[PDB]
Design a protein around this ligand. Structure first.
Ligand SMILES: C[C@@H](OP(=O)(O)O)[C@H](NC(=O)CCCCCCS)C(=O)O
Ligand SMILES: C[C@H](O)CO[C@@H](C)CO[C@@H](C)CO
Ligand SMILES: O=S(=O)(O)CCS
Ligand SMILES: O=S(=O)(O)CCS
Ligand SMILES: [Cl-]
Ligand SMILES: [Cl-]
Ligand SMILES: [Cl-]
Ligand SMILES: [Cl-]
Ligand SMILES: [K+]
Ligand SMILES: [K+]
Ligand SMILES: [K+]
Ligand SMILES: [Mn+2]
Lengths: 593, 466, 265, 591, 52
């Protein structure tokens, strides 16, 4: 009772993602090797070799040289495959121009990308996704307004708030207000930096200058707006984004400090407070410490970080910054019903790329590869997509219910995991071209685990139980193939078969609040983004507007963001096409180049 | 409630040390020798007088090849230091000085003791070692317990050394930063006394992975050096440090307390001679012979029984005592490393034994391995991070606070200590390289070097209280 | 001494696993390698070359008095102080007579004094040099080495999951193996270096012969670990490997919640 | 001879008069007659750009008419600046990775304040990025493990292959594996690896493209000194991509080189994938034999290695390369010129610690605090005061640089004179007093000039910096004002702490840094100390102050920033003529 | 010890199911161990976290 696999036939464009890699039926266990010209089969690597020759001549030191590959064998003795972004043919919304690119035509595929196009090092959409997270500072303003009204003695009104925000938008990136003879920043360098606010009080929202407003009523469907507004209440939260260029000179911990300076100044200047009045220190303290929401928490000494590093971001904060939950595709994509699978598979895309390439690679390890093929596998060619939907189809038929409604018993988790594992293995076993595409055991193992957890999370609404299904895939995978992933893959899988429902000191913690500093997760690729997706989808499936923090969810519902948090697979593909214009470049102040 | 079940404590020669000991009496919350071990780590430091003297003399302060240069031959450099060469160059000496610290070690030790001591007969000790090159220092409990931190021996010793040297040699104002640097290194630009000459067995107090991890941030190489490679004493020291650490982490409580206490007793203290017996039975064989010995011993002692026989004849076993089963797997795990890494006399395979002893146990029995996932998980992480480009190192640099190896609840680091003890010199980051001074100086403390008999004797002294 | 059962063995695949890992079962010799060819393939030392050392002979290093160490006799390589050397093999996903976790289990049951890593694409074995040579006779010459599906390769190891070549041979980027006159022959050593004469491994097995001896489950041939009617079905209706897998998950979950919860289960 | 701020030595420019078109001795100015920000080319251009940005994004931004109470900025002259001393340079004309060769001796005048804002100036950003993307290691342990554990000989030929492979993989490529993603070489052309050694025979056997050549980069006496410390050892200096640190932190550098150097060892020596020896390589690179630019910081300001806050003052001193320039070796009528060393080393020292670190990590905003720090490297003001003290002392003590006895009395005498001279000039030139309108600029400048003179003249870096703090009463009791509210925390306390040995008080200046608690917060100080440390060592005949490995590691013409001539480089960035590394042009749309 | 004892005793007293383990842990420990602090938890000391 199962449909044709999505990796052989995309739902609308009917592309065969696996066949396209080879021009041969992927069911056939036969291939010729050593006949591709090595790297000459790759446009990017061939172009890179030519560029490298020019670079060597200019700088006097050799660089990229494919002929160094070991023992006379250039890379490319097998097909160096291209990739198709999963699911783009099933989108119908999100066609607006963004700060990074003109409007995408929803439904348009991105196929034929090379591996190097989806390397974090080469892909500005991926870098900008992280930069947008870490340059964000979020604060309640209630205490600052209280200090002004009682200590200083001046009334706060919508008019004074509007002036405050106009001044903060002048000074957050570019300008000065109070002082003579003060240096300023070139506006071209900081055009991505701005500040807005949101509130659950609709009368206040309507009284504010809409240019400074994240409009919850406009951004979210009514049931989600209702839930978010109920949590925000009659309060005002500020969302400020410091310059991308600035975090690229330093760290995300700059954000709360920077906004502390500039918001304090905007208060002084909008309310005419004397320079050096004692109230000033309440503003910076409020912004840095007193009423503050961070994307990430600090990390301990071995991996020391201030706030707003990727390693400090809780899984559920990665879940909730993603905005797929408010898209038409997520709200009506299952024949008019909500589609938590779409939420899962989108949210896991920045989840995986940022935690594994942005953080584990570009902070904790590194090098020229970005570990890119490992992670490309989770958002391309409809493979994980097919397996995840398979579990949902199976479960909806078996339990005769909708998403989020299968009883969240351990037995039901194990049944769904057994079927999704089975289906994953059936396809890798029956399609030699797919087994060769996902040539690393880690890709295949993470994919069956992720699909299982996606199905359980979407079908039960329970994020811990969905992630329990991930770890149960360990024996199901190992006892079938007699191989798993790379040498160090199954640290967390083995131990979380036990830790998921432990309460020992550093073992127990809800999945929403786990993150890259949970010790089991602190080292290895191929996992955290899956959990992130599962958390997001579990909440979506049970009728919630967010999983972990309504302030985070609202704070990223903002069309002025450089990265489109609603459609991350698409965005990464656009970066793969070299069509994503990031923020933070220094063109305004450097020579013609 | 008290852990009243009786165990026998055996030495590493397989002979009983003390019989009829309630499990309660070996726990860190009760046993005086275990508690004194923590206290000695907290209160002892070493002062490297030879190192301080050398730094001051040559200008090679701190670490990282730092050198503050004094130039005694300025007129031979081919430079003019005056416009037109009006005045010939004259050398100065402004960053270095020669103090006879090693030759004066006995008097220095007396002055140091007087500064550290709070009251006569309070237990403050300073011992001259290495013919004056090193002082061993143990501060009094009175001083150490004044506040809340474990760093008081380190901080008071560094300041006392700096003050007493400034006074003894009546040094001028210029010397203050330099003598400070000789003892403190780069402190306070660094939180650590980085490149200094006051050394603790404990890491800097900024470095924990979580609250309660200080007794876990001790490399296996330090443990092996301090026990001079006597395998089961290294195991006992590591296991006991881990046991203290797990109390401080809050994990030796409530429905987990017995489980945690049994890991220590069975893996760390050769309870009921299990570790010795398993090695004796299987020592001429392979890891798998230890698997057979472990399951056999668990059956013999009634810890497990056949639960179900499947149609193929394969038998699932049930744990009649789950916490004791876990502890027997932990004992088998250290025995397996001893047999496997002992046969090779090479530590590197310890990570593989950690993984596959546990994996074989599960396939053999249908029961969960040590730590319900952590034994295999750390087998995986430790194997990876001792054989790959990404991080880590050789076995001896890991600890209970290292991100790679922290997860297991007390039963992983002791097997590293066993493997490194058995290694014939196959490493380049062995105990001699990372921990030579630690082994030479702190290894003279009998309780650190030879904890098994001390713990057993202390348990026998309190056994009638439970 | 207790008699091991090793793992559940309810079918041909799992009985093949049990045979590989049970040290009381002799692995049949299926090819002969000259000493020169054998050492050339390994690539660490050639015939007649002295063993290199990493440390002095064990009797000269001053081992401490240590009653536990006494119980464990050193291997010959340990007594000599040989360097610890690595050999790497890769088993195809396509019906190999041994696969990667079975290598680890076998090594730990059959060979003394080992280090060993399992990866999806290769398996390392690291032992004192002379000890490694003895182990490699089993790895290269017995029924656990089909020349086309179980290959020796120290790096650039991709191929386990690649499609088979037109002759049924697993891919090797460095081309250390080639099919010549129906025989598999190493035209380069495990390191990809030149060899004076190719090392003949003889004929590969046919696909039906590989399937009779394989340790892997495969859905396409009709033998998946998990059959279509197995998810959620009672234990008595599923393979013993799945019964075992379910048990391990239940007991890890419950035991790590509170250990006493698994008493008698 | 006129003060340098009224007449530059060779080009004869009057740096103060050029700001006004009026005699700077006259205490008279008109105000409110300049058109506000219209007098500024950068601020006027910014306002026009801002209007377009507002239109495009739907949110207003820069708007000078928001300035308080209807007074636009620019009610007084918004002054331009001239980079100090460029007319006195004669060397350093080589093409660099960031710009075509400067013609030595060419002035850079008329820069606006915004051209010298860290936010707007890629030369300043690249200076920091070059520091933090550097990883330095001894290779002896890696070679020892290969020879003993693995059993293969290390030779010049294997080292050359290792470096060719590391230069392939550090930025761009893969060597061992099939089907592996790689980085576009255009994005990482600034990333490379080299080595240096004190063994001349080994140096001559290596491929020189991979060599930092101590004999070539340094004058003989300095090469001798550095080679004696390095000895018969090889040190690797690797620079990871600028783009990479801009996605993360400088702590990436040792991790990244750990990966790539480990791979180059595996591939140059044919080591099996997964051999246990592999872990020795990464451990050596990350922990076992490593030199960092910066040490880790505690929780409130938590950082891994290689943040600006972890860099010791003497490491900032020694990364500067002015010490090996002709200007520093022969600029005082054929004698060494420690003043040139001080005033150049303090330029990155002040800009990186104050703008790069205190501002761009600990605080921030749109100003870069730029005018505060511009004052220390422009218009020859600090220059005049520092040389005044040196000339005074050489005449009084009848000796050369580095030779005045390092007594407390002599420190106080020199400080009193330089303070006096600084105050004389600020008092006698109302145009100069208005140029350095913030008390902090004037206070730091007299303290810096005093410490420069004492450090240069005694060779003693702690005593030179003691002279800085003694300027506190000398300044306060003359003017009855000092600097900004929080300026004199460290000055007041270091009148006592300099020669204290209390726990967190005593420490030699070489090893102080932005985590010494007195220094952890405030602008206008640390770079001065950095310059003083560098000049004290130069004056007494040394090739470096703190770490010979650091000094050698930055003697490298492939660095993006020219560490020999930082004032010039910052001026080139002010002209928008410095091309930084790390931009993403290769993979973004046309623009 | 207080955080773990509270977590264990609550799990035991109310005989809670496996789902409760992470949630009861969170009730006392907050965001630990993702944070070094027991951040947002319900066991409070006069002393700061030992990382600080
Ligand atoms: C292990 C540890 O490194 P060290 O052993 O301390 O050098 C740690 N790195 C990592 O966890 C690297 C993680 C990314 C590489 C593995 C990806 S599967 C760290 O930087 O603190
Ligand atoms: C390990 C054992 O087979 C697990 O049994 C479960 C299937 C059922 O047990 C639960 C429902 C009660 O403990
Ligand atoms: O071979 S290892 O599994 O150690 C690393 C894979 S990227
Ligand atoms: O006015 S204050 O001295 O507090 C700040 C100067 S930037
Ligand atoms: Cl320390
Ligand atoms: Cl129990
Ligand atoms: Cl031979
Ligand atoms: Cl806390
Ligand atoms: K709006
Ligand atoms: K060169
Ligand atoms: K004096
Ligand atoms: Mn550009």
């Amino acid at each position: 009772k199962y449909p044709k696999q999505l990796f052989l036939e995309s739902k609308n464009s009917k592309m065969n993602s696996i066949e396209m890699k080879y021009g041969q039926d992927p069911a056939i266990n036969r291939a010729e090797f050593h006949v591709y010209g090595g790297v000459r089969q790759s446009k990017r690597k061939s172009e890179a070799w030519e560029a490298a020759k020019r670079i060597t001549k200019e700088r006097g030191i050799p660089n990229y040289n494919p002929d160094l590959h070991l023992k006379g064998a250039q890379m490319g003795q097998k097909v160096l495959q291209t990739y198709r972004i999963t699911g783009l043919d099933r989108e119908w919304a999100g066609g607006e121009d963004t700060p990074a690119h003109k409007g995408w035509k929803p439904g348009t595929d991105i196929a034929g990308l090379e591996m190097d196009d989806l390397n974090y090092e080469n892909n500005p959409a991926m870098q900008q996704c992280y930069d947008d997270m870490r340059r964000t500072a979020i604060n309640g303003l209630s205490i600052a307004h209280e200090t002004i009204e009682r200590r200083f003695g001046k009334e706060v009104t919508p008019e004074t708030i509007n002036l405050y925000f106009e001044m903060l938008n002048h000074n957050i990136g570019a300008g000065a207000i109070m002082m003579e003879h003060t240096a300023e920043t070139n506006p071209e360098l900081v055009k991505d930096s701005y500040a807005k606010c949101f509130t659950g009080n609709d009368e206040l929202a309507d009284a504010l200058d809409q240019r400074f407003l994240i409009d919850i009523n406009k951004m979210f469907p009514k049931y989600q707006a209702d839930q978010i507004k109920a949590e925000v209440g009659d309060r005002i939260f500020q969302v400020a984004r410091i310059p991308t260029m600035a975090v690229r000179t330093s760290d995300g911990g700059l954000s709360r400090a920077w906004v502390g300076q500039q918001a304090s100044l905007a208060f002084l200047c909008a309310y005419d407070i004397p320079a050096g009045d004692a109230v000033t220190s309440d503003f910076v303290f409020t912004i840095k410490h007193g009423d503050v929401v961070f994307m990430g928490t600090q990390l301990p000494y071995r991996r020391a970080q201030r706030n707003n590093s990727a390693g400090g971001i809780a899984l559920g904060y990665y879940s909730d910054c993603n905005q797929t939950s408010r898209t038409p595709e997520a709200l009506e994509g299952l024949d008019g019903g909500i589609d938590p699978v779409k939420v899962i598979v989108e949210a896991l895309t920045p989840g995986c790329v940022i935690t594994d390439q942005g953080w584990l690679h570009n902070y904790l390890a590194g090098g020229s590869s970005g570990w890119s093929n490992y992670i490309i596998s989770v958002y391309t060619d409809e493979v994980l997509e097919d397996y995840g939907y398979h579990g949902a189809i199976y479960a909806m038929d078996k339990w005769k219910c909708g998403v989020g409604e299968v009883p969240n018993t351990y037995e039901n988790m194990m049944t769904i995991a057994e079927e999704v594992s089975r289906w994953s293995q059936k396809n890798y076993d029956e399609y030699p071209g797919l087994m060769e595409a996902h040539f690393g055991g880690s890709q295949r193992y993470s994919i069956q685990a992720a699909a299982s957890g996606a199905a359980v999370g979407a079908m039960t609404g329970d994020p811990d139980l969905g992630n329990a299904a991930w770890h149960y895939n360990t024996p199901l995978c190992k006892e079938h193939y007699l191989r798993l992933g790379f040498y160090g893959h199954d640290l967390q899988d083995q131990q979380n078969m036990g830790h998921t429902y432990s309460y020992r000191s550093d073992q127990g913690i809800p999945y929403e609040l786990k993150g890259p500093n949970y010790p089991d997760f602190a080292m290895n690729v191929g996992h955290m983004g899956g959990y992130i997706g599962i958390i997001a989808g579990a909440a979506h499936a049970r009728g919630a507007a967010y999983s972990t923090n309504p302030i985070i969810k609202a704070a990223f519902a903002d069309p002025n963001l450089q990265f489109d948090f609603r459609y991350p697979r698409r965005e990464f593909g656009i970066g793969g096409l070299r069509q994503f214009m990031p923020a933070g470049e220094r063109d305004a102040v450097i020579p013609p180049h | 409630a008290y852990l009243t079940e009786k165990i026998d404590l055996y030495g590493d020669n397989g002979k009983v040390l003390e019989s009829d000991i309630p499990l309660e009496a070996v726990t860190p919350v009760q046993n005086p020798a275990v508690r004194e071990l923590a206290s000695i780590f907290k209160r002892s430091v070493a002062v490297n007088l030879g190192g301080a003297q050398k730094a001051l003399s040559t200008g090679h302060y701190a670490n990282e090849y730092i050198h503050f240069p004094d130039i005694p031959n300025k007129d031979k450099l081919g430079i003019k230091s005056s416009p037109g060469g009006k005045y010939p160059p004259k050398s100065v000496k402004v960053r270095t000085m020669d103090l006879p610290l090693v030759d004066d070690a006995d008097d220095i030790a007396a002055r140091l003791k007087e500064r550290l001591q709070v009251n006569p007969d309070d237990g403050t000790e300073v011992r001259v070692m290495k013919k004056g090159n090193v002082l061993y220092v143990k501060i009094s409990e009175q001083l150490a317990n004044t506040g809340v931190e474990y760093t008081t021996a380190l901080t008071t010793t560094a300041q006392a050394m700096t003050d007493l040297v400034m006074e003894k040699y009546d040094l001028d104002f210029h010397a203050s930063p330099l003598v400070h640097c000789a003892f403190y290194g780069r402190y306070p630009q660094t939180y650590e006394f980085m490149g200094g000459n006051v050394i603790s067995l404990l890491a800097a107090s900024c470095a924990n992975e979580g609250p309660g991890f200080a007794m876990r941030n001790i490399m296996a190489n330090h443990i092996v050096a301090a026990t001079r490679k006597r395998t089961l004493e290294a195991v006992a020291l590591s296991s006991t440090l881990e046991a203290i650490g797990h109390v401080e982490m809050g994990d030796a409580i409530g429905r987990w307390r017995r489980w945690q206490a049994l890991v220590h007793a069975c893996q760390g203290l050769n309870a009921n001679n299990v570790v010795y017996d398993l090695v004796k039975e299987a020592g001429h064989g392979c890891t798998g012979d230890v698997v057979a010995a472990t399951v056999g011993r668990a059956l013999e002692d009634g810890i497990i029984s056949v639960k179900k026989t499947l149609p193929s004849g394969y038998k699932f076993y049930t744990a009649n005592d789950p916490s004791m089963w876990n502890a027997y797997v932990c004992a088998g795990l250290v025995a397996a490393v001893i047999v496997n890494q002992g046969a090779a006399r090479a530590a590197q395979g310890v990570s593989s034994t950690l993984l596959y002893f546990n994996d074989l146990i599960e396939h053999e029995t249908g029961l969960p391995h040590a730590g319900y996932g952590d034994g295999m998980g750390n087998g995986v992480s430790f194997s990876f991070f001792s054989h790959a480009i990404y991080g880590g190192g050789s076995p001896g640099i890991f600890s209970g606070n290292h991100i790679v190896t922290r997860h297991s609840k007390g039963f992983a680091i002791p097997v590293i200590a066993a493997a490194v003890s058995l290694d014939s010199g196959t490493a380049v980051y062995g105990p001699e390289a990372t921990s030579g001074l630690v082994g030479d100086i702190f290894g003279e403390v009998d309780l650190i070097r030879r904890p098994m008999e001390a713990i057993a004797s202390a348990a026998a002294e309190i056994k009638d209280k439970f | 001494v207790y008699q091991r059962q090793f793992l559940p063995a309810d079918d041909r695949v799992t009985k093949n696993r049990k045979k590989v890992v049970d040290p009381s079962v002799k692995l049949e010799k299926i090819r002969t390698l000259s000493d020169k060819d054998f050492l050339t393939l390994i690539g660490h030392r050639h015939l007649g070359e002295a063993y290199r050392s990493v440390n002095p002979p064990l009797a000269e290093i001053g081992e401490p008095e240590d009653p536990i160490r006494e119980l464990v006799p050193p291997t010959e390589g340990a007594k000599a102080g040989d360097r610890v050397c690595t050999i790497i093999m890769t088993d195809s996903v396509y019906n190999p007579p041994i696969a990667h976790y079975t290598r680890a289990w076998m090594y730990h049951n059959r060979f003394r004094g080992i280090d060993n890593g399992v990866y999806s694409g290769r398996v390392t074995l690291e032992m004192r040099e002379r000890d490694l040579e003895e182990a490699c006779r089993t790895l290269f010459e017995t029924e656990i080495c089909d020349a086309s599906r179980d290959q020796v390769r120290q790096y650039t190891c991709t191929g386990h999951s690649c499609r088979l070549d037109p002759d049924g041979m697993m891919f090797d980027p460095i081309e250390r193996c080639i099919m010549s006159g129906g025989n598999v022959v190493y035209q380069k050593d495990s390191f990809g270096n030149p060899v004076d004469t190719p090392i003949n491994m003889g004929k590969p097995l046919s696909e039906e012969e590989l399937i009779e001896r394989t340790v892997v489950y495969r859905t396409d041939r009709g033998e998946p670990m998990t059959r279509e009617g197995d998810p959620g079905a009672p234990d008595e209706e599923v393979r013993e490997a799945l019964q075992w897998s379910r048990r391990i998950q239940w007991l890890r979950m419950l035991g790590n919640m509170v250990p006493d919860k698994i008493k008698g289960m």
